[PDB]
Design a protein around this nucleic acid. Structure first.
Lengths: 142, 126, 58, 188
RNA sequence: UCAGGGUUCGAUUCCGGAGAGGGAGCCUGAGAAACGGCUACCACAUCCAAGGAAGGCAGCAGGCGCGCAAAUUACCCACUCCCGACCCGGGGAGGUAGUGACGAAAAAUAACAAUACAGGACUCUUUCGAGGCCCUGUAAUUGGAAUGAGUCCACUUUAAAUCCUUUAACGAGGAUCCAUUGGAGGGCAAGUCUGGUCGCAGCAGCCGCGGUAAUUCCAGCUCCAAUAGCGUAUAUUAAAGUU
C-alpha cells in the first residue's frame, strides 16, 4: 500500500521495478538463458532427426486409447525426443532409421490433451509431407 | 492522312550548333508512327533537308491516339557528327560499332601482363 | 474383434467407398456475392419467431 | 550493395477484430449488394480513408480558433472534400466533417455514376462496360471502376469513339455472323 | 505495436568505428602500421627431377561444409559518377536482363433479353375469380450482342534486346478458356440429414466426443467464412489495472 511519491524519488522507483520483474515466471526464463540451454531445439521452430523406435502410449483417464508415437534422435545435438503421428493409419508411412522433420505441439513446450509427456509432432517423412501422403497427392520414392 | 505533328517547349542552342524541342504526334486508329515519317514531316516544317534531323524517345499513352518524343536539328552534318553520341549516328549508317566481346578484351590484357618488351605475339594473334 | 488391438488404419480401411455425385460449376467473385445478396435480403418468406437457419434438415 | 531503387509503400485497409459478429456480417453484405462490389477488402478500403479524415479533423479541433496551423490545414481539408462532391459548399466547417458516412464516398465511384447517369441498365452492367474499354472521361479512355469523379469532371462521362456503341467498328461476333451468313449461299 | 502513459527491436542500402586465417614487425609516400604491398613465427595446404618454388573470395559469379533457413561461373560503360599525361583510355563501382507466393498497389472468372412457373403492391368483386406492375430463382432448354487470356505480323522501346503502351489477322455456350484453403456441440458464422465403426480406429489449443439408434471419428450430399489466396510451428506487441 505505501508507495513513495516525492519529486526526487526516481532512483527508488526505477530500481525497485527492476528488482521485482524477476518474480514474473515468463520474464525470468526469457532472460536467465537456462531455459535456452535446456530446450532440445536451440531456439528453432523445427528440427530434423532420425527414427529409432515406434511405440504406443496409453491415454490418461477418463478416456481409453493407444496413441501412436515415435522415438527420434536429433541431428544437430544427438539428443533424444518422442513425437506424435497425426491422422488415421499414418504410422504405416514412417518405417525405421530414416529422417523426419518435427515441430512443436502448439503450447510452447507443455504437453497437449490426453497424451502423457509428449511435447512434439511429426510433419515431414523422407522429404514428403504427411498431408500429401494421406490425401494421395504423392508417395514415398522407392 | 489524319497523322498530325506539333512542337512544344522549343529552344535554339548556339553552344551545340542545334535547335531542340519536344514533339507531339496525333494518330487516331493507327499503330505508332515510324521515325522516318516523323523526320521528313519536321524537314517540311523547318524547310531543311531531313539529313541533319535526329528524333528519339517516343512513348504512347493508354487508350492510344497520342504520343510524345524529343528531337534536334543541327546547323550542318559536320557539326552533327561531332556533337551527337555515337549510337544515334549508327541508327542510320554514319558510324560502325566494334565487334569484339568484353571477355576477349579482359583476357588479352591479363596475358600481356606476363611478358616484357615487344609483346605483340600476345596481341595480333594471341 | 478381428485381428489384434492397436492395429493402425482400421476404420479408414473398413469404410465403404463412394464416388462424387456433383456435375455443375459454381459462380466466382462478384457473381457469388450478387447471388448471396439476392437469396438473403430481396425475396424472403416469413415464419413464427423460432426462425430457421440456412441448412435445416428436419 | 547501394542501388538507385526506393522502398516506400503502405497498406490501404485494416481487418476487423471480431471475425464472426452477426451484426457486422449482414451490414457489409448489404453495402456489397447495393454498390456491386467484388469482396470484403473493397469495403474495408473505404472505411480506412474515412477513419484517417476524421482522425485529422479531431486533432485540428483541439487547437485555438485562428491558430495559424488550424487556419492553413483546415482550409485545405475542407477544399479537398468539396472538390470530389462529398461535402456541400454551403456548409464548409470542420464540425460537419464528423457527420460524414461511408455511403457518401461509395456514391462518387465511376461505376455508380455510369449506372445513375443512364449509360447502363444495372450496377452490375456498369462495371462490365467500364472494364471492357467502352467508356471515356473527358478525352481519356478509363478502365478502372473505383476511379473517383471530381465535381467539374462530372459532366464529361461518355462512350469511347472506337467502340461498337459510340460510333466505331462492329465487334468480332457481328462481323463473323454476317460473313458466314453470306457464305450460306456458297463460296464463303 | 500503441486511448493517454508505455513495451520490444535495430547484422542490413545514409553517417561514425573496426578487420582482411591468428599474433607481431616494416618499406614507400602528403596520407598506410596497407594485406588485389613485403618479412618472420603459429594453423592449414599446392607443385617437384626431393635440390627447390609458390599462397590468403568477410569483391562479383560459382563450389564444399553447416543447418529449419537464402538466386546466374549472363550482357554493357548508353545513364550516374570516379581515376590518369587525357574532349579520345579504364571501371563485376554502377546500370540491364534471369531466378523470386519476403512483402506492397490495381484487378477477370458473366452481362442482357424472351418464355413457363414463383413473391408482393394495386384495381374490379361480399367471398370465389380475373386484370395487373416491379423484383427472385431454376429446368426440359431458347436468342443475339460485348470482351481479354492465348496465338502472331509491324511500329515504338534500348548500348542491343525483352516487358509495358499502340495496331492489322485468328480466338467462348458452359458437359469449358472447369478457384482454392479450412470448417458445420460450445467459445464462434454454418446440419437435433443418410451410410460405416463400436472406449477400437481416431478427434480434441480449452471444456469435451467414441462402450451397437455418434449434432464431434471415416465418407456422400447440403451449408458457412475469407478469396488469388488459406492453414500450421516458433519469437514478439496489444488484450495485461496479470509489473
Amino acid at each position: 500500500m505505501g508507495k513513495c511519491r516525492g519529486l526526487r524519488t526516481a532512483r527508488k522507483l526505477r530500481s525497485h521495478r527492476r528488482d521485482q520483474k524477476w518474480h514474473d515466471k515468463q520474464y525470468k526464463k526469457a532472460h536467465l538463458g537456462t531455459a535456452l540451454k535446456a530446450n532440445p531445439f536451440g531456439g528453432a521452430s523445427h528440427a530434423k532427426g532420425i527414427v529409432l523406435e515406434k511405440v504406443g502410449v496409453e491415454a490418461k483417464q477418463p478416456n481409453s486409447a493407444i496413441r501412436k508415437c515415435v522415438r527420434v534422435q536429433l541431428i544437430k545435438n544427438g539428443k533424444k525426443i518422442t513425437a506424435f503421428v497425426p491422422n488415421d493409419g499414418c504410422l504405416n508411412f514412417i518405417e525405421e532409421n530414416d529422417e523426419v522433420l518435427v515441430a512443436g505441439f502448439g503450447r510452447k513446450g507443455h504437453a497437449v490433451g490426453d497424451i502423457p509427456g509428449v511435447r512434439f509432432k511429426v510433419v515431414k517423412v523422407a522429404n514428403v509431407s504427411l498431408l500429401a501422403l494421406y490425401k494421395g497427392k504423392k508417395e514415398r520414392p522407392r | 492522312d489524319t497523322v498530325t505533328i506539333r512542337t512544344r517547349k522549343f529552344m535554339t542552342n548556339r553552344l551545340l550548333q542545334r535547335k531542340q524541342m519536344v514533339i507531339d504526334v496525333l494518330h487516331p486508329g493507327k499503330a505508332t508512327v515510324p521515325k522516318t515519317e516523323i523526320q521528313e514531316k519536321l524537314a517540311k516544317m523547318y524547310k531543311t533537308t531531313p539529313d541533319v534531323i535526329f528524333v528519339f524517345g517516343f512513348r504512347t499513352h493508354f487508350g492510344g491516339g497520342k504520343t510524345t518524343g524529343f528531337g534536334m536539328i543541327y546547323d550542318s552534318l559536320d557539326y552533327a557528327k561531332k556533337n551527337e553520341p555515337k549510337h544515334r549516328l549508327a541508327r542510320h549508317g554514319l558510324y560502325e560499332k566494334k565487334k569484339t566481346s568484353r571477355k576477349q578484351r579482359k583476357e588479352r590484357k591479363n596475358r600481356m601482363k606476363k611478358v616484357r618488351g615487344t609483346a605483340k605475339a600476345n596481341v595480333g594473334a594471341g | 474383434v478381428h485381428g489384434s488391438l492397436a492395429r493402425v488404419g482400421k476404420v479408414r480401411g473398413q469404410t465403404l467407398k463412394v464416388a462424387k455425385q456433383e456435375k455443375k460449376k459454381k459462380r466466382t467473385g462478384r457473381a457469388k456475392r450478387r447471388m448471396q445478396y439476392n437469396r438473403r435480403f430481396v425475396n424472403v418468406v416469413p415464419t413464427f419467431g423460432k426462425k430457421k437457419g440456412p441448412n435445416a434438415n428436419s | 550493395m547501394p542501388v538507385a531503387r526506393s522502398w516506400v509503400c503502405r497498406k490501404t485497409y485494416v481487418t476487423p477484430r471480431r471475425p464472426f459478429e452477426k451484426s457486422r456480417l449482414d451490414q457489409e453484405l448489404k453495402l456489397i449488394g447495393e454498390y456491386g462490389l467484388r469482396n470484403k477488402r473493397e469495403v474495408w478500403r473505404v472505411k480506412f480513408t474515412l477513419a484517417k479524415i476524421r482522425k485529422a479533423a479531431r486533432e485540428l479541433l483541439t487547437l485555438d480558433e485562428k491558430d495559424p496551423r488550424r487556419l492553413f490545414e483546415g482550409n485545405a481539408l475542407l477544399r479537398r472534400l468539396v472538390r470530389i462532391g462529398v461535402l456541400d459548399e454551403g456548409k464548409m466547417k470542420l464540425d460537419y466533417i464528423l457527420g460524414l458516412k461511408i455511403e457518401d464516398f461509395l456514391e462518387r465511384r465511376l461505376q455508380t455514376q455510369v449506372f445513375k447517369l443512364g449509360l447502363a441498365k444495372s450496377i452490375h452492367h456498369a462495371r462490365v462496360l467500364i472494364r471492357q474499354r467502352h467508356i471515356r472521361v473527358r478525352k481519356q479512355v478509363v478502365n478502372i471502376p473505383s476511379f473517383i469523379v471530381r465535381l467539374d469532371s462530372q459532366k464529361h462521362i461518355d462512350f469511347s469513339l472506337r467502340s461498337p456503341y459510340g460510333g466505331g467498328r462492329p465487334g468480332r461476333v457481328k462481323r463473323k455472323n454476317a460473313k458466314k451468313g453470306q457464305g450460306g449461299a456458297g463460296a464463303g
